[PDB]
Amino acid sequence: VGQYFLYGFSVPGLYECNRYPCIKEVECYVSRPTEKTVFLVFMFAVSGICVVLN
Amino acid sequence: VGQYFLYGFSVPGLYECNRYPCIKEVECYVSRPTEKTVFLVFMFAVSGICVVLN
Numbered sequence: 001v002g003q004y005f006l007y008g009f010s011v012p013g014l015y016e017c018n019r020y021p022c023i024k025e026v027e028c029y030v031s032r033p034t035e036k037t038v039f040l041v042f043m044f045a046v047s048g049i050c051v052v053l054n
Numbered sequence: 055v056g057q058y059f060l061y062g063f064s065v066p067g068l069y070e071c072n073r074y075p076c077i078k079e080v081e082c083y084v085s086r087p088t089e090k091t092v093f094l095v096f097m098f099a100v101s102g103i104c105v106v107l108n
């Protein structure tokens with residue numbers, strides 16, 4: 001449940017952030033999103049299989 | 055009238071712009087605003103004196 005609520009399914013390649021150091025909203029880029037989301041989906045499937053067995 | 059409507063009185067030292075090349079709104083800085091606005095005010099005063107004489 002925590003993994004589902006925290007990370008989700010897909011990893012956004014493009015992010016928009018606006019904190020104190022940055023004067024206005026800025027656009028940052030993430031590296032290798034596809035591999036991260038694929039492996040996250042695989043981990044979620046493995047956890048679901050383990051839950052079903054339990 | 056054209057000078058009053060176009061430029062105004064004060065020259066903003068800080069500008070906020072958002073055009074097609076710039077993804078989001080960005081903050082640009084102007085150099086020597088005080089001298090520009092002072093000389094513009096002097097030119098406006100000279101034009102007003104000339105208008106009064108005319």
Ligand SMILES: CC(C)CCC[C@@H](C)[C@H]1CC[C@H]2[C@@H]3CC=C4C[C@@H](OC(=O)CCC(=O)O)CC[C@]4(C)[C@H]3CC[C@]12C
Nearest residue numbers: 008009010011041042044045046047048049050052053
């Ligand atoms: C032992 C058995 C029951 C395991 C079954 C595994 C499922 C819990 C997993 C396997 C594949 C997963 C799917 C793979 C791909 C996607 C697309 C994905 O779409 C997006 O990321 C874009 C849309 C959105 O933001 O939801 C939404 C989740 C979903 C349906 C996943 C939902 C969860 C699924 C069905």
Ligand SMILES: CC(C)CCC[C@@H](C)[C@H]1CC[C@H]2[C@@H]3CC=C4C[C@@H](OC(=O)CCC(=O)O)CC[C@]4(C)[C@H]3CC[C@]12C
Nearest residue numbers: 062063064065095096098099100101102103104106107
């Ligand atoms: C022959 C005689 C009638 C000439 C008179 C000259 C005036 C037309 C000029 C001289 C000084 C000028 C002033 C000098 C400084 C300012 C402050 C200036 O304030 C700002 O820039 C911030 C506020 C705003 O945005 O209006 C507004 C215009 C004003 C009153 C100017 C209005 C026009 C004035 C009165």
Ligand SMILES: CCCCCCCCCCCCO[C@@H]1O[C@H](CO)[C@@H](O[C@H]2O[C@H](CO)[C@@H](O)[C@H](O)[C@H]2O)[C@H](O)[C@H]1O
Nearest residue numbers: 001002003004005006007008009010011012015037040
């Ligand atoms: C052992 C048990 C552990 C229990 C753990 C419970 C953790 C709870 C975390 C609460 C977090 C609240 O803040 C939560 O942040 C996440 C991610 O940061 C946001 O999540 C959002 O962005 C992430 C990526 O950043 C996307 O993958 C997701 O789909 C989207 O919803 C949630 O919208 C927000 O609700």
Ligand SMILES: CCCCCCCCCCCCO[C@@H]1O[C@H](CO)[C@@H](O[C@H]2O[C@H](CO)[C@@H](O)[C@H](O)[C@H]2O)[C@H](O)[C@H]1O
Nearest residue numbers: 055056057058059060061062063064065066069091094
């Ligand atoms: C010989 C006669 C010539 C007649 C000339 C008539 C020119 C008319 C120009 C119309 C322009 C309309 O666009 C006009 O742009 C100016 C400046 O770009 C804006 O002006 C705004 O920004 C400028 C600085 O950039 C400030 O100094 C000004 O106080 C503020 O109002 C006006 O808010 C907008 O109305």
